[PDB]
């Protein structure tokens, strides 16, 4: 890692944080529209919001490689895919 790589990482970290925060806010939107209590840790939606929350608020900043980012990205990808299918069954 050099100064440019390191910053380009900081930029990917940023991109991911924003993208994540966007999805978390959508998760909260979905969770409320279902009456799912916040600490209902048994609910799979609560787990996703909780995991993601732990990353945006802590773990992304602790990332040291471009690979870790691609992993977190495809993880968000996974979330979004499930979130999109649930809102379309909803406004169906």
């Amino acid at each position: 890692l050099n100064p440019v790589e390191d910053y380009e990482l900081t930029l990917k970290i940023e991109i991911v944080k924003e993208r994540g925060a966007n999805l978390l806010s959508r998760l909260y939107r979905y969770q409320d529209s279902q009456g799912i209590s916040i600490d209902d840790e048994s609910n799979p939606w609560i787990l996703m919001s909780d995991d993601l929350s732990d990353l945006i608020h802590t773990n992304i900043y602790l990332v040291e490689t471009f690979d870790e980012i691609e992993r977190y990205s495809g993880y968000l990808d996974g979330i979004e895919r499930m979130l999109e299918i649930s809102e379309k069954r909803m406004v169906a």
């Binding site: 440019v4 390191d6 910053y7 900081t10 966007n22 929350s53 608020h57 802590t58 602790l62």
Partner: protein, 244 residues
């Protein structure tokens, strides 16, 4: 319209307190760090430094992220294409207020994205933070104003890729002025300036020179080898976003 009932604030607030508390532990010796610096300078760098420096144990409170949490965000986006901000910061700010208050009572480590273009907001914040028994520090991020203005434009060409339906840069003079004044009024135990490559370029603990002065040479100094390098990379990536 854009109103929010009081059970909605307590709802999203209670949620956020559950959210941010996660995996963090309280302190008899807690630390609060305020963030200054041009918008597109990459404050996200300081997050990386201070998260690793506290080994996961610091709560970051970024006012901007709390915007989508307005109980009628969708409605306000499906009209105010970009001017939804003044209807959201009413909500977002008080969200920060309540979060800083409660967590500062519970003695967590706090990292707060600061409105350093204004003198008062941070001053009045660290004051109510020091009473609670906080070592309160300032953490500034600095690069050449240009590269800063550049990343904001890079960002805005990526904020248009996501949703077509979705700055604070021209501040260099306010930023220097407000730093000298916060330094003289001795509000912060420790003042630190960081550069994009996570280097600590000034630390008020070690150094004796004015934090404001170090800023000016950093802004108005001749360009470093690496800075000119970053300037081309931007001209590179903007052009792709010129056609992506």
């Amino acid at each position: 319209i854009q109103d929010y009932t009081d059970s909605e604030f307590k709802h999203a607030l209670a949620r956020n307190l559950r959210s941010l508390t996660r995996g963090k532990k309280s302190s008899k010796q807690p630390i609060a760090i305020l963030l200054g610096g041009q918008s597109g300078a990459g404050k996200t760098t300081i997050h990386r430094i201070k998260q690793k420096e506290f080994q996961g144990n610091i709560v970051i409170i970024d006012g901007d992220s709390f915007r989508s949490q307005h109980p009628h965000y969708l409605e306000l986006q499906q009209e105010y294409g970009k001017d939804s901000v003044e209807y959201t910061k009413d909500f977002a700010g008080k969200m920060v207020e309540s979060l800083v208050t409660k967590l500062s009572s519970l003695g967590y480590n706090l990292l707060i994205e600061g409105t350093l273009r204004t003198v008062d907001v941070p001053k009045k914040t660290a004051q109510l933070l020091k009473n609670k028994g906080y070592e309160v520090q300032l953490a500034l991020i600095a690069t050449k104003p240009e590269l800063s203005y550049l990343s904001t434009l890079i960002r805005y060409e990526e904020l248009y890729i996501i949703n077509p339906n979705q700055h604070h840069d021209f501040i260099v003079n306010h930023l220097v002025d407000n730093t000298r004044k916060l330094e003289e009024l001795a509000i912060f135990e420790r003042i630190q300036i960081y550069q994009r490559d996570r280097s600590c370029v000034y630390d008020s603990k070690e150094n004796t020179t004015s934090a404001a002065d170090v800023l000016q040479e950093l802004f108005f100094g001749e360009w470093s080898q690496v800075e000119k390098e970053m300037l081309q990379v931007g001209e590179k990536r903007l052009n792709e976003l010129l056609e992506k």
